Amino acid sequence: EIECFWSNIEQVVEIKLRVELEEKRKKALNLQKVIADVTAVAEAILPKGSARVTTSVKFNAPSLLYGALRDYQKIGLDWLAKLYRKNLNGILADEAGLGKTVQIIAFFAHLACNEGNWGPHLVVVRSCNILKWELELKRWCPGLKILSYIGSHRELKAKRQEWAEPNSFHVCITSYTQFFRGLTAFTRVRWKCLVIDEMQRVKGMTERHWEAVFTLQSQQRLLLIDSPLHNTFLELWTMVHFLVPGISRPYLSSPLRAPSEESQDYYHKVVIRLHRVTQPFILRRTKRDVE
Amino acid sequence: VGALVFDIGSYTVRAGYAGEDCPKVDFPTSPLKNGMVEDWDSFQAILDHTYKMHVKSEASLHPVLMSEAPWNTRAKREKLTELMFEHYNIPAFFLCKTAVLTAFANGRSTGLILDSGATHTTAIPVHDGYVLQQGIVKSPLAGDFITMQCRELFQEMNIELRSWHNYMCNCVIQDFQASVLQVAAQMPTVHYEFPNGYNCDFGAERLKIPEGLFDPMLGVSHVVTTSVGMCDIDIRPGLYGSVIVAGGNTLIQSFTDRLNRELSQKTPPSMRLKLIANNTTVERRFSSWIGGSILASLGTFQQMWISKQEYEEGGKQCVERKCP
Numbered sequence A: 001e002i003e004c005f006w007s008n009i010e011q012v013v014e015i016k017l018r019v020e021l022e023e024k025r026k027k028a029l030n031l032q033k034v035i036a037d038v039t040a041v042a043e044a045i046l047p048k049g050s051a052r053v054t055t056s057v058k059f060n061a062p063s064l065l066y067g068a069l070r071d072y073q074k075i076g077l078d079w080l081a082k083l084y085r086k087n088l089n090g091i092l093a094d095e096a097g098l099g100k101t102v103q104i105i106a107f108f109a110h111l112a113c114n115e116g117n118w119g120p121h122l123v124v125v126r127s128c129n130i131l132k133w134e135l136e137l138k139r140w141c142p143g144l145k146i147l148s149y150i151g152s153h154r155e156l157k158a159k160r161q162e163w164a165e166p167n168s169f170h171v172c173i174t175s176y177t178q179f180f181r182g183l184t185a186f187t188r189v190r191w192k193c194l195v196i197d198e199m200q201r202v203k204g205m206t207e208r209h210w211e212a213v214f215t216l217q218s219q220q221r222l223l224l225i226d227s228p229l230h231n232t233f234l235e236l237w238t239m240v241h242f243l244v245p246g247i248s249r250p251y252l253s254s255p256l257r258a259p260s261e262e263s264q265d266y267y268h269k270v271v272i273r274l275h276r277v278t279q280p281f282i283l284r285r286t287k288r289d290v291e
Numbered sequence B: 001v002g003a004l005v006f007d008i009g010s011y012t013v014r015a016g017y018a019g020e021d022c023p024k025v026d027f028p029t030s031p032l033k034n035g036m037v038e039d040w041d042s043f044q045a046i047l048d049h050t051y052k053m054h055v056k057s058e059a060s061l062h063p064v065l066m067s068e069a070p071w072n073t074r075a076k077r078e079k080l081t082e083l084m085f086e087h088y089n090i091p092a093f094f095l096c097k098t099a100v101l102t103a104f105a106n107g108r109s110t111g112l113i114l115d116s117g118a119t120h121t122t123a124i125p126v127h128d129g130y131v132l133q134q135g136i137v138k139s140p141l142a143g144d145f146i147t148m149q150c151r152e153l154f155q156e157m158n159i160e161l162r163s164w165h166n167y168m169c170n171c172v173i174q175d176f177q178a179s180v181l182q183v184a185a186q187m188p189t190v191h192y193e194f195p196n197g198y199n200c201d202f203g204a205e206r207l208k209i210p211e212g213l214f215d216p217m218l219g220v221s222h223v224v225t226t227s228v229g230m231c232d233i234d235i236r237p238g239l240y241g242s243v244i245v246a247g248g249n250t251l252i253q254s255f256t257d258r259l260n261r262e263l264s265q266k267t268p269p270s271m272r273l274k275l276i277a278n279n280t281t282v283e284r285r286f287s288s289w290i291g292g293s294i295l296a297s298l299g300t301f302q303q304m305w306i307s308k309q310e311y312e313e314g315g316k317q318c319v320e321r322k323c324p
Helices: A002-033 A037-045 A071-085 A100-110 A130-140 A153-161 A177-181 A207-214 A233-243 A261-281 B040-054 B074-088 B098-105 B143-156 B163-179 B220-230 B236-240 B255-266 B281-297 B308-313 B318-322
Strands: A090-092 A194-196 A221-224 B004-007 B012-017 B025-028 B064-068 B095-097 B111-116 B121-127 B137-139 B243-245
Touching: A037 A071, A037 A233, A037 A261, A071 A090, A071 A100, A090 A100, A090 A233, A090 A261, A100 A130, A100 A221, A153 A177, A177 A207, A207 A233, A221 A233, A233 A261, B004 B281, B012 B040, B012 B281, B025 B040, B040 B074, B064 B074, B064 B098, B064 B281, B074 B095, B074 B308, B074 B318, B095 B098, B095 B281, B098 B111, B098 B121, B098 B281, B111 B220, B111 B236, B121 B220, B121 B236, B137 B220, B143 B163, B220 B236, B220 B255, B243 B255, B308 B318
Parallel strands: A090 A221, A194 A221, B004 B064, B064 B095, B111 B243
Antiparallel strands: B004 B012, B012 B025, B111 B121, B121 B137
16 A cells, blocks of 8 residues: 555656646747957967877866766866966867867866856857757756846846856856847856857847957856857957957957058057967867867 | 544644644643553543544544554553543544654655654664564663753753643753754853743753763664664665654754764665655654654555444454554
8 A cells, every 4th residue: 555655656756747748848838938378378278189189188077077078078178277277268169060068068067166166157159059058068067057048038137137146156148139138238247167159140240249249257258169260350359358358458449440451450460469369279170180 | 524643642742634734733742651551541531632622523523543652562552442442432543653654754664763752762663664573672862861961950050940830841951952952062152041031151061961862871873773783684774775763852953963973884884874854843743643644644544444343343352453
């Protein structure tokens, strides 16, 4: 009889499964309702090429990463660890199909207990692109506290209100429509690990959104290079300041705007700066090396 | 006709319906000094006081279930069924061990139970819903002992710590325990105030008083580790991963915690020893009543009681036959 009401409690368990299934159904229903400092340091540190799988990974899969790593994934993790260690924003340019997400999740779980490094990291992503990336984040790191940013303006505002709090959760996220609705709401905290991807094809990149993408507050920032950064002034000298903040020139103090001819010469000096800042962080190579 | 489930525990009586979560009446119990009915008339009277004053319902209507001590003697059970059916004329009856209900309250049939009441703290390993009488270990280092330490440690403080004053005298030493007693070595302490306002800086007394049950006689850890020794050989791993605690007397700060350490360092480290943390007073105080309330409610309870019928066809003998 004990086994019998344990059976009835097991039908309670299947009722719980019904509750979870209805919660996923309601997920669908609501979704329907819905100068060269960092440069030189990265040149020295970031292992690349033959040093993409064979290096000194002095920080492997952390305690909080309940998942494995590819050798070059471990190396990206180690480079990110040093990158924060040296107060650096850095680009993680592991080619797509090689698992940038594994490196980023491992770095989220590693930039952690020790310093207790807890700013709700970040990932700047698309509304549609947030889903799979967050799925991976919780897959490899089901322990790291995370917060999502997609939903009704009520839910989005509630999430935004709790972003300013430091140590609140490991990882923060942001889409790009709510970026229209959250333009200056993402420059709040000096996030301990900021990450930018998909910024390239953001709709309506107005000067508003230009800047808001540019000078997000961070104690660290990351970037994913699906394709090497581009020969457009704004985006990439941002990516540079991003890479080299705290410089003698505050970002909004941009030295001459527009690519005029004289501004083209000043921009060629800035392009020397540009290449030197961007190259060190491009761990970009084909599957052939590290398939 | 909602089934009534009463706990007649040594120091308080927990009473209520099967379908309700809480015993609607929890009042002080005495005719249960050793653990079983010492005074049948006083026992019968307090039961009478229960049906009429505590629940305001005749016993003749609702089905009734009573819980009894694991180590109790049979003669108590035969007489209880004799007294209960004859006097109250209930339609259906049942008897279950308090330890069994706790394991039922904790939703874990196979387990080991630690509880304490008036004068007694015991260890009872239950397998497959069956109490192993041979495995039971009964110790005197109950809550009363610790409170008696409190009372003496209050008398040495020379505070002014008819029967009601004794009830007050006993009530306070228990109330002090919950607030203060935790298991110079204690650093600055609480400022607990008596109703009249008297108090003191209750220092190491909060740490030394609880230590008696571990070291005043068999400590609680010794009570249990031996109990499993006395039981079967191969089920012992099951008990260790299923140890439970119940009883208001077990409500001391870091009590369950210190128990985990004492056992973790006494059991083989390889063992999967685990404690189920029903440490809340409400959990502990209700644990026995909860199991009984669950038991009566179920749809197979409809065949498990000793109906009034069984008692006409057979006398006291049914108790040993229907209740494990």
